[PDB]
Amino acid sequence: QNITEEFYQSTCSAVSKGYLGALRTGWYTSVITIELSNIKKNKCNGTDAKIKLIKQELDKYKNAVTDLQLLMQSTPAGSAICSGVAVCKVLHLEGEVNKIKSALLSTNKAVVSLSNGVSVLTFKVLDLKNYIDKQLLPILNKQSCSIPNIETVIEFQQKNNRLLEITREFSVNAGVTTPVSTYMLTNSELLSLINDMPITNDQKKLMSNNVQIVRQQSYSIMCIIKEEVLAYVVQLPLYGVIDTPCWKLHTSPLCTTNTKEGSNICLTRTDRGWYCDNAGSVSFFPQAETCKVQSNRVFCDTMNSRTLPSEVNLCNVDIFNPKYDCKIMTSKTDVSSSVITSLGAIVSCYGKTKCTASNKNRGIIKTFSNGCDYVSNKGVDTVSVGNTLYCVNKQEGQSLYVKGEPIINFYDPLVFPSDEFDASISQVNEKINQSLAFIRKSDELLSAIGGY
Amino acid sequence: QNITEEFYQSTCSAVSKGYLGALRTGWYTSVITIELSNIKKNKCNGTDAKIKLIKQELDKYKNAVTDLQLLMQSTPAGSAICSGVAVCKVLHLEGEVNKIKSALLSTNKAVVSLSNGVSVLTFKVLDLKNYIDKQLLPILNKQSCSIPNIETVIEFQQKNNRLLEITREFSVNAGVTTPVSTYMLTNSELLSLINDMPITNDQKKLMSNNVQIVRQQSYSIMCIIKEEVLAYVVQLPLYGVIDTPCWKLHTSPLCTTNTKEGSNICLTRTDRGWYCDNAGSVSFFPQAETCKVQSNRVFCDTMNSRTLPSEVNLCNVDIFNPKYDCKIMTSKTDVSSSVITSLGAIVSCYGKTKCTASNKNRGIIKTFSNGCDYVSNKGVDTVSVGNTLYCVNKQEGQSLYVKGEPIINFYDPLVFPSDEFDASISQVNEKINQSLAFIRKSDELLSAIGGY
């Protein structure tokens, strides 16, 4: 509940703490269906402007239907679309759409079991068939084309509008749209759907508190236009874990403070990103895009996560812990750079580059020395390095500065490796061992030279 | 004005010149506010189609307000918001919304000073509160509930349309929407905002000349919805530097001309991208996405730029100058490839691949030899390498071809490094010296075979 950032100068890395994350571990497919009308022939003769507008709207509807049929011809349109594709093929089988229609005739929501053996909730968001057949079809059939009420046209447009907006978003995306817009599924409809989902109370509460992340993680797959039914699968996320202890790790380059150019060796911890607890193991998220962050809850997605044993956490507080092998990168470029964490900023200055930290009212207040150093988030509102300007966030929480001797010091630059994208403490240790083995082999060579 | 694209065959690199620059170094946050109406109860008892449409529009408005409240629950939703969310929490403090509401009562635009010590300009784009309370609220209050005419419904739809699209963009983007659409801020209102922004008149002129780049660089953060106010911070860019001399650098692989496979060593300068002059130092932009290019003015953004000493410019005309140590890449793959510069194209052919330059009417006119060669943009219109095809842009300007001996010739393939992501001439020469020291040590060993 309280974020306690901890900066370790030993690696000069900032590990946040006290996050209540909620991993996404499943999907739930809802067959959202719209009842279309199979109207193709116009018979009444009317030159009125209102009748022309109605016919134009019907032409737009027919073109939308044809575009959806083309999208179906594009269908089937990992773990992201499968169950959407699986329901797409199931609805193609004879009788499945008829069973959906029969079940949803009585109510706008139902639970339907299909031939595949899976039961899914079906939601009738829009009933265009009823409106078309009951209101404008009688006028279109009679030769008079008797429309004395303009509002119906507008009403029709409104009733048609969503469908067009459904088709357009489909047409540009070829039947796979994400995030789910408010046209695929309204927020009220989505919230009403979360209650009918077969989940715990905790999951309903979690996905009702943060509904926007549900849309950001959702999907909408074109499935089938057939038998006066337009069915698309809305693939909502499923959070198996809730309020698990999650923490972020920000890493900044640590290079030697040597003034002479060339002797700069930079060691950056590569396990940068998010970590969460799940089933006794740590789910690691390297990409920062997958883990959305609300005020205190780190919503994530195990679609690309990596499972890890628990002792990886022991690598955060102990670099040389025998339990886990931390991952580091050895480079030579010592370009000054800063990273804005949740409760401050890490700033690495090398060479002749200047770094300043300034407050809004007090102006420039701090000048940074060589190396990587961390500044808190209260009383320091901006940090300028060279010519670039990173704003320090104003998030409220405890921050701890830990005095740590830089780990780059104990590694000799001459034998230190270069441009190693991903390594490990034992991996760099054995690289150093092999380099020193070459060194002592050369020592043996000169020893033989001296003795002979 | 005169773009003097100079190609150097030494490293076969094309440097453009004569480019004016407008660097982005600041932000200006304007609190764009919409006056909502807190209506929750409907007293109408009419079943007319117009009344049904009015109720539907009001329900859409209420759902938009609820969605904006959920987005507020997502707020605060790295200076692109660090300055933007700082105004959100200020507006959360008691009385800070009320002062804006009172100050903007008289005029649709006013500078308001907040409790943070920073005064910002507030702009009332849409007064929905007045329209709701003065036109449809009296209709709702009366028991008759008779809409005066359908044009009132259409006007209500048109006024509410901007708010509905604002809510849609906010919901799909979770509040932070970029580029700023024409619903966030109309172009006329954006121009007025630029006029009332306190800046150099040069900045006002430059922004008025290129509003599209302003939109592409802009932001719109949802701050607050409270007290019949919907405030979002539109933070426009702020160009502290104007008409600074900028220049691009395009680099193409330079590999050995030997036909035998495996002997091709490829050198490609990694400092490619844009450079600009700023306060006596060069702002380098590693990637070309940040620096949008107009006819002659290359609008940029220092949020990702790197400061560099001035003498880096002397690196472009002299890669071996002791003033600056340029950046290169030493790879082995000699795949034929072309890069289309502003006034021609660089084409690198190796192995058995064929490269042709062709004109629209004259057809194929030139066949390329081994190495990297540059072709101008007048008299040649297309370049085909292997099976792939690129153009040459028809931009008008002087292009100078410079005869330069290939720098790859001076580097011996046996000791040349491989797959180096980002090297430097000092780095390459020092590792070459290390390899030569290794071969000298092996010579010492073979001599120690004798000598005794």
Epitope: L20, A22, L191, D202, K205, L206, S208, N209, N210, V211, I242, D243 | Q69, L70, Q73
Partner: nanobody, 121 residues
């Protein structure tokens, strides 16, 4: 300490709308869920929906068509309303609390003083 005060009439004619308000004190509504349990005379307790911290609600499937729970954070108040109340719905209503997204929440710890509701004309 924490406390919940319940206001609103209990007796209501059949097939009418019954309203009630639970005003909380000692904690923030923006952190505590607030359920609504019902105890018929001489019978056990039954659940009548809930409204979460974010304002969303999860009604009971039986009363989903009539039950209505709302919340206002600023006044720290919760509102319950039922429609089409019939003779069977005479009971005692408790505006019980909840916790967080965890077991260790003291599920239903601090209950209201309880408001009797006798549905009759």
């Amino acid at each position: 300490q924490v406390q919940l005060k319940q206001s609103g009439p209990g007796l209501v004619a059949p097939s009418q709308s019954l309203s009630i308000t639970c005003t909380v004190s000692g904690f923030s509504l923006t952190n505590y869920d607030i359920s609504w349990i019902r105890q018929p005379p001489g019978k056990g307790l039954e659940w009548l929906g809930i409204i979460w911290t974010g304002g969303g609600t999860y009604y009971n499937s039986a009363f989903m068509s009539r039950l209505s729970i709302s919340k206002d954070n600023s006044k720290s108040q919760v509102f319950l309303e039922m429609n089409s109340l019939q003779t069977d719905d005479t009971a005692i209503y408790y505006c019980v609390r909840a916790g967080a997204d965890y077991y260790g929440s003291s599920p239903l710890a601090y209950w209201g003083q309880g408001t009797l509701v006798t549905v009759s004309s």
